[PDB]
């Protein structure tokens, strides 16, 4: 438990460095007294430092770790909001439906303010254009999630994240393409 985001990640660390390290950087950073749930607040702001700590332990760049957590995050989630997934018959529908159906669905589950700005579209050459913009700059995760989704549905895609606010552009551009286009 403890934050759905931190929950899936907690498990991932239990597999890599183990629960012992998870508690070491957590108790050092996050509170040992305060306990959250897979439905309570989940300030990602703290995550960044967490994915960095563990990254220092795996001796991997923070960008490669966060990316991974994104993939894992889609997996475990498909278990939580599974009913919400069984609404989409394919990877594509999910990409053009993200904020729309999934977001809408989330709102029904809980109040919540507003989800990041996400816009998807379909292309003729079996491609899907996805636009992701958020001040959290968690874009790296975005890719991880998308890549994971496809895999779940036995699909092999490629995401070209050329435009990235990291530069200062209007937003992030994630071009997707289906294998054997
Ligand atoms: C491939 C599909 C999905 C994509 C591409 C996606 C992408 C993202 C991204 C990148 C963020 C914003 C992080 C940020 O701006 O800091 C996010 C947050 C979130 N997503 Fe998804 N998501 C997907 C599916 C879902 C699913 C499985 C659920 C619904 C059950 C969901 C639940 C959430 C929640 C609750 C947050 C946290 C919001 C917050 O803490 O501010 N997403 N997602």
UniProtKB/TrEMBL annotation:
This is NO-binding heme-dependent sensor protein. It comes from Shewanella oneidensis (strain ATCC 700550 / JCM 31522 / CIP 106686 / LMG 19005 / NCIMB 14063 / MR-1). InterPro entries: H-NOX_domain_sf, Heme_NO-bd, NO_sig/Golgi_transp_ligand-bd. One of its GO terms (molecular function) is heme binding. Residues 2-161 form the Heme NO-binding domain. Zn(2+) binds at residues 139, 161, 164, 172. Keywords: Heme, Iron, Metal-binding, Zinc. The lineage of its organism: Bacteria, Pseudomonadati, Pseudomonadota, Gammaproteobacteria, Alteromonadales. The keyword Nucleotide-binding does not apply. Heme b binds at residues 2, 103, 114, 132, 134, 136. Pfam families: HNOB.
């Amino acid at each position: 438990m403890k934050g759905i985001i931190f929950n899936v990640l907690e498990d991932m660390v239990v597999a890599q460095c183990g629960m012992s390290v998870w508690n070491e950087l957590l108790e050092k950073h996050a509170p040992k007294d305060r306990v959250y749930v897979s439905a309570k607040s989940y300030a990602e702001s703290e995550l960044f430092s967490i994915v960095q700590d563990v990254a220092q332990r795996l001796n991997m760049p923070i960008q490669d770790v966060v990316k991974a957590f994104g993939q894992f995050l889609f997996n475990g989630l498909a278990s939580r909001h599974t009913d919400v997934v069984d609404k989409f018959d394919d990877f594509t529908s999910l990409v053009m439906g993200i904020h729309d159906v999934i977001g809408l669905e989330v709102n029904k589950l809980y109040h919540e303010p507003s989800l990041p700005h996400i816009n998807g579209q379909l292309l003729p050459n079996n491609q899907i254009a996805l636009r992701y913009s958020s001040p959290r700059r968690l874009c790296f995760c975005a890719e991880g999630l998308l890549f994971g989704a496809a895999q779940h549905f036995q699909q092999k895609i490629q995401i070209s994240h050329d435009t990235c606010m990291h530069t200062g552009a209007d937003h992030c551009m994630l071009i997707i393409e289906l294998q054997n286009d």
